[PDB]
Amino acid sequence: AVGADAAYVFEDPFNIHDLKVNVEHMTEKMKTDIQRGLVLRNEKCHDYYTTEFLYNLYSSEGKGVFDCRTNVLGHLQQGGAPTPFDRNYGTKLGVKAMLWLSEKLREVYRKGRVFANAPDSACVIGLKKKAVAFSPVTELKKDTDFEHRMPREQWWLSLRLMLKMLAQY
Amino acid sequence: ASGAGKAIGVLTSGGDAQGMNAAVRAVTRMGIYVGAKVFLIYEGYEGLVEGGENIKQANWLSVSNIIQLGGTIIGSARCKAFTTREGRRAAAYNLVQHGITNLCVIGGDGSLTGANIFRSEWGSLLEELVAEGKISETTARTYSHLNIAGLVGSIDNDFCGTDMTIGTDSALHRIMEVIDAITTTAQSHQRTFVLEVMGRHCGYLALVSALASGADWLFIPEAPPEDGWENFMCERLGETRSRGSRLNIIIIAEGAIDRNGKPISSSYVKDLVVQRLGFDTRVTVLGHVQRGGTPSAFDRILSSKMGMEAVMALLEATPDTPACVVTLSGNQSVRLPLMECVQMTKEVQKAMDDKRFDEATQLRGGSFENNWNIYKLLAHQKPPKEKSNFSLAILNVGAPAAGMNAAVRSAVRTGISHGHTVYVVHDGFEGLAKGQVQEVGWHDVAGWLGRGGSMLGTKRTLPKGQLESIVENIRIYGIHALLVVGGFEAYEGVLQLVEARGRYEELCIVMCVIPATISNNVPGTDFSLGSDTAVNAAMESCDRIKQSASGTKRRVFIVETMGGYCGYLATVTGIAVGADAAYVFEDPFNIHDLKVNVEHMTEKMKTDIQRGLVLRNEKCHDYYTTEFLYNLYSSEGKGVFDCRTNVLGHLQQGGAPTPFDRNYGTKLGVKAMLWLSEKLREVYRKGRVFANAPDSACVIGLKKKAVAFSPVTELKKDTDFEHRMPREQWWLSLRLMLKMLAQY
Amino acid sequence: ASGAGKAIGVLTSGGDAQGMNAAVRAVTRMGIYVGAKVFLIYEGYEGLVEGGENIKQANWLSVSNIIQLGGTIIGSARCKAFTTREGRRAAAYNLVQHGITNLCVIGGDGSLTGANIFRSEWGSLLEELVAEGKISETTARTYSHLNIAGLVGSIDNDFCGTDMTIGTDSALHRIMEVIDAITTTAQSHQRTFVLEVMGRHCGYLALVSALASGADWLFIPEAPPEDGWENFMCERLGETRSRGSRLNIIIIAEGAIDRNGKPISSSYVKDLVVQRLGFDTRVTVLGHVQRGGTPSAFDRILSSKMGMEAVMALLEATPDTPACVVTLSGNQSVRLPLMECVQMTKEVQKAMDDKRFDEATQLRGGSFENNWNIYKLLAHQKPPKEKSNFSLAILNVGAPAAGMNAAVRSAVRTGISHGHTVYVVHDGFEGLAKGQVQEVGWHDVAGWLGRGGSMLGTKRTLPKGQLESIVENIRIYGIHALLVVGGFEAYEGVLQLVEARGRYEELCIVMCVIPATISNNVPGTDFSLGSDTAVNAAMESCDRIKQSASGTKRRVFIVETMGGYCGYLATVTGIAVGADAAYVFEDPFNIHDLKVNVEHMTEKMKTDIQRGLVLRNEKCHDYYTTEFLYNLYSSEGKGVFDCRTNVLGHLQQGGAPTPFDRNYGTKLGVKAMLWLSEKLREVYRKGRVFANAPDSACVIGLKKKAVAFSPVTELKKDTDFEHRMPREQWWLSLRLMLKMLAQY
Ligand SMILES: CC(=O)Nc1ccc2c(c1)OCc1cc(-c3ccccc3C#CCCCO)nn1C2
Ligand SMILES: CC(=O)Nc1ccc2c(c1)OCc1cc(-c3ccccc3C#CCCCO)nn1C2
Ligand SMILES: Nc1ncnc2c1ncn2[C@@H]1O[C@H](COP(=O)(O)OP(=O)(O)O)[C@@H](O)[C@H]1O
Ligand SMILES: Nc1ncnc2c1ncn2[C@@H]1O[C@H](COP(=O)(O)OP(=O)(O)O)[C@@H](O)[C@H]1O
Ligand SMILES: O=P(O)(O)OC[C@H]1O[C@](O)(COP(=O)(O)O)[C@@H](O)[C@@H]1O
Ligand SMILES: O=P(O)(O)OC[C@H]1O[C@](O)(COP(=O)(O)O)[C@@H](O)[C@@H]1O
Ligand SMILES: O=P(O)(O)OC[C@H]1O[C@](O)(CO)[C@@H](O)[C@@H]1O
Ligand SMILES: O=P(O)(O)OC[C@H]1O[C@](O)(CO)[C@@H](O)[C@@H]1O
């Protein structure tokens, strides 16, 4: 969305070879009319290559061609008012979820039982493809990495190729 | 580049010296770096005459974890069989069996003479081995010459071509550890101690440790006491202890003789003191403790430079070259004929037996004579009756450096005996601004020689911000000379006063800087006072960190060190501990060099020696901090090593000074005060401001073989003020040695 | 609270001991803290009989910068005049002139007897001074009683009511420094050394330093050698040196006698070895080096606890209380009658002269007997011919701690002589997973006693993540017992195997933990192996930092220390250097406490002692890091002091172990292996899995006066696993002492 020259992300391996390559690309750009750079870092993209590590690296190997600065966007990214998509989507999930909650809550009966013991009764709603899916919370364990708190395959990893192509790799 | 295809043997022989490990390590690593095959020849010449399992080939690891060990890991047995030609021919056979053609000998004058002989007849030993058919003529035409390089390993300093034999500074660390012990129990009880030290026929250890400890009397075989001396000793022991002292230390060399050449015992000295002064008195025959313990930083660094030169001296020698000994001649190594140095040493033993004690003194060396003349000065000094016109002031400026207190003591005493009203000023130039100036007596400075830190106190404050008040205390106390002992702010401080002589009539004052700092960054000198304590205090700490890394296998340590912008302390410490890199401002480095140093660190973890150490100077790089190196090594080493950081801080200022900082501080304090008093009569009482010339404001320092006095304004062109250091520094050649011993 | 209005005198007397300064400092600071007037009584009893200028009142600063100094700053002259009633009456007069009513004596059994007498007739000396009219009756009714507290200062450990006299650990540091020297020169040349040590009539220094150095023979006057011993010595010196060794060390006490009570000289031992073995042999009469140098951490901390108790013992004493001596009885101090302890000491000299050498041994103490029995064990041990069924394995786990190598050596040797196939496993439980297991012989472990680090290698890895592979190497090598030497991961490691005996048939195996860590955080023991090296390595570094701060006047240092969540290492180091605070997890602290500690640090900069030191444990606080304290002190101190940070890291793991870590590691390695072998026959060959009971998986440790073996599962309730430490820790009472000596 901003045409950043790299985005450092945990789902990609990177090391000082990749960083030194991204810095010599950043150097070669300063010969052009567009004498600026932006690299994004995810807050946990790397265990030892922190934002201060990248600052030191770029500042050094760029000395005599560019200087360098750090910003940490924090709780700014939680935003102010929601976008039109988060207002539609939040409204639409709040109703589709409540229609499912009320449907399932009559699919279980008043007499001689504990209600709803089945794994079919504890779900996550979400936009999956063209429209919503309801996925059982226990069925999702195998799609989940709990140590990194995220799903094991994520649709958007194809967009990293687009980022690199628009960034002149 | 490599340049060999040939074999080097190495043996350590005769009396062992702590430092022989750092020597055999550097002979091994330089030998196999330059592409030779190195053989360790176990148990001196006794394993040269046996051969067999006593001669086995080294690899880079065969000399690992030895640089911090005393004695010698190959061992140094005596061999009367090699003193016979029947052993000496078998010693030739064992070398030419393994194909060994070059031989490094680490030892004293006897063990080096045996090597000199073993060349002088080599071809005739080879001829006899052909004549009896043990070896073929082609081999005797191949191995037709032996190259010897001598490394002079000895605690005595008994060898006349050299300022320091390998071991003699560490033996002084052992003696000064024992006197730093005995001073506390002698002071509490008010006792006299007779200390006996291992000067066999050479008084170096006795003189140098007497001068470094403030010993009240000394017995060296090159300067025996003149007739009736028992009176003059009982007067000298009386005088100091009447002059407010409490203990006395008496140093006796084991080899000590009277003026007739007949031996004087430590027992006879003890009996004499008891019977003629009634003082409670003890005798410590300090023994082979002197031969042992870890080598000092100077003996590791020296044995490394000596051991590297000895390998070069072998591989570049020729059959029409005389055999060589590698030696100091001041600041750097020189190479000398073995024949000449043996004979010039035998000529001293002969002069001493011939009762020519003044020839024995002069011929030991200029380094023996300057120590002896400064002991003979301070042994003759007193508070005078006469008194003199001049007022002197002594400042400490910078961070406190070990040996400042020695230099102040020696300047206060030389200043008092030259008749001056000496003042000491607390807190440096902020002291001279704030009027923290006090007149000092002979008593007031007693027992300062062995203390770390600064008894005056010291500051970084430069004088220009207070100068109108500094000139006013110079006027009020009537001060005619400043002696400033301290770092770069002492130098720039005295410079800010010479740059201000045109502005103020009172800065026409005689000025001397004694360069006292941890960092070795003061211009003029090649050694600053306290920098030997600093490399020893850092070297002791990196040994602890390496032993930590070696137990916690697959650690790499990043260790930060207090050099300022000056890479001396990181460089000499890195040699003294065999660090795998030392990052220094005077070298460019970047992530390519760092990634290279990390892939070298990775490849080492396949070996048995699964540890690393890299030193970082505190200002070596603007952005690659110690945390940057930690992150880099931790990352590119993940799966092969983990990594940790230590910052050595004010630990490196040390505790008590080394023997070198006690001698050097004492010697600069007197040479500076003799110059201060000389210059202060080279300017006259009438119709003038005194001393306006640039010739009157100087830095003292060891420059080559001996001192130079360099004008503070003349030094501006040799100085970088932005980085606070000189523009060319002698020790940058040692970075090559560091990298070679680190397996680049 | 204060509770005095009365005067305490203090004198140090007889043979000086490094530690007497830390004693007189703590007697002064506790005395004037509790509101008494303290007088320093210069030059022992000689200044008590002179009085005048020899008796002058202290203030808090009169004992500043002495805790790191050896000897005694007040001095300790002998006084035959006080052995006469004509001096003893003048000693009473000089005290009652200054009004001194309580008297602390720091000294040995003679100097304490003189104090016992000087009470026993005090009122009659006061009566004579009234009878001749020097003082009025009202004064003799006021000063009508003298209170004595005895502090036993001596290097010999000659005193029978006590485990350590003040000075005896520092004298062992002096001896072990000299043997760490002599081992390197004796090893290179293959020489035997006769070492003579200052055990006057007491063999403690000789036995303890023989056991700590691996000495091949020993001569103590409480256990003289039986007739014809020259054969058995020449066999023992032959055996070890035939069994792949190289040097020998022979320790002789200066006081050594034969079985007839006639003295044996170090010269007679040297002559005997030369004439009956033909070994090259030397004699070092290691002298008053033993009395000197800086006190060890144990002698500073001990002299502080002893000195604090001695002031209490004075002010709470009564005229119907017998005079007191303050002493160890294991982990903590006890107070004993002076009469009884003098007589029980005279009864040993009498038993030794009466040729009752077994009474002399038993009556020196249980601490003398356990050292002697373990020397007598290791002196009798051999590789056996018979061999036995069992396989044992030895692990190192955690960070490497000094004394691990001593404990492994002693366990490998005790395990070999008990007939077992001992294995050593490299890299701890990751080693036992990766099959890094090897059978070890008597040769393979030789010379490990003096090494720092770990010769096995050690890791933090807990066994559960590899357990299916750990059981499989236990099966494949047939291993029937584990000895694990290490920190909290050794404890939780052996616990993760007992918690898994129900899951795997192979973890029915006999298990012992020797607690080896820097941190003192293993449950069970009150002392972990390596924690004495750690407090000494930190105490040496904080002395350098304080001397740096004292030259650079108006510094305050923040120093960080490796305690884990356990405040032991920061607490005992803070006492050993007189730190102005130590921040520790086991104390709550916040910005109110920090601001209080900073305004105390500000008020001190008005005094002559313009320096500060605060210690921080590395995990003492979650948010108040060392940089937080740096910022806070720098700010609220701006205009009165500046401030600096050091992080002591892996420096605190030390170099070579202390004498205590060499004795303790050796002693735990044998007591653990004797228990391992006892328990391993308390389980039977037929129809069973061996050793399933919780009684078979234990931690050894010094608990009170002697060892306890505590089940690993029984210890869960004494353990906090989240902070990795025990829930109550004996040393939290020492934090009160730290704060009192720091001027709270
Ligand atoms: C008793 C006594 O004088 N000991 C003594 C101790 C230390 C020094 C002494 C003398 O002298 C000269 C010299 C040459 C080199 C030298 C020469 C070439 C290459 C390296 C070095 C070096 C060094 C660092 C050692 C201490 O920073 N180092 N040093 C320093
Ligand atoms: C030769 C020999 O055994 N030396 C030796 C050395 C060190 C120790 C020794 C014995 O024993 C017991 C003990 C008691 C206290 C003790 C008791 C009360 C209060 C404080 C302490 C302490 C401490 C810390 C010292 C080293 O961490 N400390 N120590 C430790
Ligand atoms: N004239 C000589 N010829 C041959 N070898 C000699 C001669 N002098 C000494 N050596 C050898 O030197 C060895 C060691 O010398 P030594 O005097 O023991 O120690 P240092 O090296 O200190 O003089 C002796 O074992 C002997 O082999
Ligand atoms: N029986 C005694 N009566 C009085 N004073 C004594 C007696 N025995 C010893 N002393 C005193 O103790 C002092 C020191 O004792 P000493 O034996 O010298 O050292 P230590 O304290 O090691 O025994 C002596 O100077 C003497 O004053
Ligand atoms: O390098 P300089 O300026 O001579 O100062 C020497 C001292 O200063 C230091 O850089 C530290 O200075 P501070 O004590 O002011 O922090 C050390 O390198 C050294 O001990
Ligand atoms: O407190 P523990 O876990 O027993 O470990 C002791 C060692 O660990 C340390 O906290 C450091 O651990 P590392 O070597 O892994 O960094 C030190 O306190 C000490 O040397
Ligand atoms: O140590 P030994 O064999 O008595 O040799 C004595 C001489 O050897 C030296 O140790 C070293 O050359 C001398 O200091 C000492 O006087
Ligand atoms: O040191 P001096 O006065 O010979 O006293 C000897 C005795 O005194 C002690 O130093 C201490 O009590 C003993 O170790 C030594 O044997």
Numbering used by the authors:
A (entry chain E): 586 to 754
B (entry chain A), C (entry chain D): 11 to 754
Copy out sentences from the published article reporting this entry, exactly as the authors wrote them.
Mammals have three PFK1 genes, which encode the liver (PFKL), platelet (PFKP), and muscle (PFKM) isoforms. At the level of transcription, the dominant isoform of PFK1 expressed in most human cells is PFKP, although PFKM dominates in muscle cells, and PFKL is the dominant isoform in immune cells. PFKL is a negative regulator of the phagocytic oxidative burst. Here, we use two unbiased chemical proteomic strategies to show that small-molecule LDC7559, or a more potent designed analog NA-11, inhibits the NOX2-dependent oxidative burst in neutrophils by activating the glycolytic enzyme phosphofructokinase-1 liver type (PFKL) and dampening flux through the pentose phosphate pathway.
Cryoelectron microscopy (cryo-EM) of PFKL in the presence of ATP, F6P, and NA-11 revealed that PFKL primarily formed stacked pairs of tetramers. Structures of the stacked tetramers and masked tetramer were in the same conformation (Cα root-mean-square deviation [RMSD] 0.65 Å). In the higher-resolution structure, ADP and F6P were clearly bound to the catalytic site, whereas the product and allosteric activator FBP was bound to the allosteric sugar-binding site. NA-11 was bound at the AMP/ADP allosteric activation site in a different orientation from that of the nucleotides, with the pyrazolo-oxazepine backbone of NA-11 bound to a pocket containing the aromatic residues F308, F537, Y578, and F670. The acetamide nitrogen is in position to donate a hydrogen-bonding distance to D179 (3.1 Å), while the 4-pentynol substituent occupies a narrow channel with a terminal hydrogen-bonding interaction with Y578. We identified three residues in the NA-11-binding pocket that are unique to PFKL: K315, V545, and V582. NA-11 had significantly reduced activity to PFKL3Mut, with no activation observed at 200 nM and only partial activation observed at 1 μM. These data confirm that K315, V545, or V582 in PFKL impart specificity for NA-11 activation. NA-11 binding in the nucleotide effector site mimics allosteric activation by AMP or ADP, inducing the active, R-state conformation. Inhibition of PFKL by ATP (at a physiological concentration of 3.1 mM) was relieved by NA-11 with a half maximal effective concentration (EC50) of 14.00 ± 2.91 nM (mean ± SEM). A high-resolution structure of PFKL confirmed binding of NA-11 to the AMP/ADP allosteric activation site and explained why NA-11 failed to agonize phosphofructokinase-1 platelet type (PFKP) or muscle type (PFKM).
